[PDB]
Amino acid sequence: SLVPVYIYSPEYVSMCDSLIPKRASMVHSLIEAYALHKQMRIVKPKVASMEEMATFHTDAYLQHLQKVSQEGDDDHPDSIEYGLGYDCPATEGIFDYAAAIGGATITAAQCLIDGMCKVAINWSGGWHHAKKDEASGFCYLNDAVLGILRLRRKFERILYVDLDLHHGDGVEDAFSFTSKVMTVSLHKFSPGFFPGTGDVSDVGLGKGRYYSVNVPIQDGIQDEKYYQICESVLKEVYQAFNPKAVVLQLGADTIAGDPMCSFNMTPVGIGKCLKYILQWQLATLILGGGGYNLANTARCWTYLTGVILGKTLSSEIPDHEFFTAYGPDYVLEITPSCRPDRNEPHRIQQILNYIKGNLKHVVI
Numbered sequence: 001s002l003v004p005v006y007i008y009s010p011e012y013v014s015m016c017d018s019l020i021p022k023r024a025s026m027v028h029s030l031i032e033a034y035a036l037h038k039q040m041r042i043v044k045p046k047v048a049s050m051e052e053m054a055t056f057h058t059d060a061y062l063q064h065l066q067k068v069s070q071e072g073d074d075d076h077p078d079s080i081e082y083g084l085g086y087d088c089p090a091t092e093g094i095f096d097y098a099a100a101i102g103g104a105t106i107t108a109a110q111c112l113i114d115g116m117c118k119v120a121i122n123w124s125g126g127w128h129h130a131k132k133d134e135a136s137g138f139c140y141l142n143d144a145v146l147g148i149l150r151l152r153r154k155f156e157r158i159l160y161v162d163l164d165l166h167h168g169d170g171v172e173d174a175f176s177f178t179s180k181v182m183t184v185s186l187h188k189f190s191p192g193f194f195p196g197t198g199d200v201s202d203v204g205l206g207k208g209r210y211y212s213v214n215v216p217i218q219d220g221i222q223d224e225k226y227y228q229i230c231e232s233v234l235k236e237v238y239q240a241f242n243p244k245a246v247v248l249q250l251g252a253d254t255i256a257g258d259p260m261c262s263f264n265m266t267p268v269g270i271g272k273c274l275k276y277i278l279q280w281q282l283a284t285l286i287l288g289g290g291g292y293n294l295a296n297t298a299r300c301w302t303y304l305t306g307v308i309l310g311k312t313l314s315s316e317i318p319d320h321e322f323f324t325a326y327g328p329d330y331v332l333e334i335t336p337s338c339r340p341d342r343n344e345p346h347r348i349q350q351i352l353n354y355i356k357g358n359l360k361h362v363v364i
């Protein structure tokens with residue numbers, strides 16, 4: 001105990017990048033290269049069963065994933081009806097892949113419930129876009145939702161924090177009408193930017209009003225600003241909501257160098273957000289997500305695992321399998337691009353206040 005659970009397994013990693021460039025392997029490989037796995041408790045992930053996946057997804061949709069997984073993106077009549085397309089490729093293995101991811105996250109939640117640790121990690125998870133009966137944005141199964149549902153079998157109030165560049169709409173929609181789970185997401189909100197939801201006036205509905213928190217941010221934000229913002233909101237959510245457990249997806253598609261070319265963050269900035277949450281001392285389920293500069297994604301998460309362990313890593317990338325992927329420079333640190341931060345300090349303030357306000361109506 002008191003020692004972090006690391007959901008991994010050579011078979012689990014093979015499955016994650018078995019469709020979608022091999023990224024799971026690079027992440028684990030860099031963590032292993034830093035010997036971080038020796039400081040954690042490695043736990044083999046179970047594979048989610050239909051019942052478990054049905055906790056959120058409809059069987060009609062789950063069955064479709066099987067069908068397609070077994071055959072292919074062939075001219076199937078119901079594929080469009082279920083989100084499969086360019087954004088969410090129909091392929092062989094799709095159902096198995098989802099099931100492994102869903103199980104990994106459910107397994108991590110189990111570890112947290114069983115008191116086996118205070119932090120459980122699943123870097124291959126965090127696919128927050130999936131809907132109950134529809135695929136979206138590379139998410140076939142919403143593992144985060146399944147983890148949250150699993151945690152509730154033990155924790156009264158769950159706080160979901162999504163730091164992916166994209167709005168965590170799949171997760172938000174799932175708990176839109178409840179106050180048992182609060183979703184907070186910092187993301188890019190601009191015309192035509194996927195998924196198109198998450199404006200700041202998006203606060204939830206019914207008993208869920210004010211239990212959905214969204215922070216729209218513009219291109220080029222850097223560590224300092226981000227942390228100011230994120231810490232501002234979190235401090236207020238912790239006071240107003242009083243979570244007993246935390247699910248945190250840390251997609252790296254916000255990091256400088258990403259093909260998404262939106263935010264201008266470094267892993268140190270995200271790591272500060274992570275330390276803040278860790279400080280709370282609550283059961284925490286860490287998830288991955290976006291991140292499409294593979295080498296950059298692994299650099300980031302390897303650094304965050306270090307943060308979790310409270311360990312300092314060396315700037316120099318250790319030699320290992322995918323070593324040549326680490327740049328002219330082969331270092332851990334990432335350098336923010338020379339792009340402007342179009343986040344007007346005034347609007348950011350209007351947002352913080354608007355959120356502070358809505359969090360006022362929260363009383364447990």
Ligand SMILES: CC(/C=C/C(=O)NO)=C\[C@@H](C)C(=O)c1ccc(N(C)C)cc1
Pocket residue numbers: 020021023138259260261291292
């Ligand atoms: C999103 C993108 C490029 C964006 C871009 O170029 N924007 O400008 C490329 C895809 C093919 C990709 O790399 C990927 C990697 C891992 C993954 N999972 C681990 C599920 C799913 C997809």
Ligand SMILES: CC(/C=C/C(=O)NO)=C\[C@@H](C)C(=O)c1ccc(N(C)C)cc1
Pocket residue numbers: 086087089129137138164165166194251253289290291
């Ligand atoms: C949906 C998304 C990111 C989601 C995310 O990060 N969720 O966390 C990115 C889209 C806009 C994209 O750029 C793209 C590029 C290539 C591609 N194929 C080659 C199949 C499919 C999609």
Ligand SMILES: [K+]
Pocket residue numbers: 162163164165166167168185186187
């Ligand atoms: K987000």
Ligand SMILES: [K+]
Pocket residue numbers: 175176177178179180181182183204208211212
């Ligand atoms: K909610």
Ligand SMILES: [Zn+2]
Pocket residue numbers: 164165166251253289290291
């Ligand atoms: Zn994303």
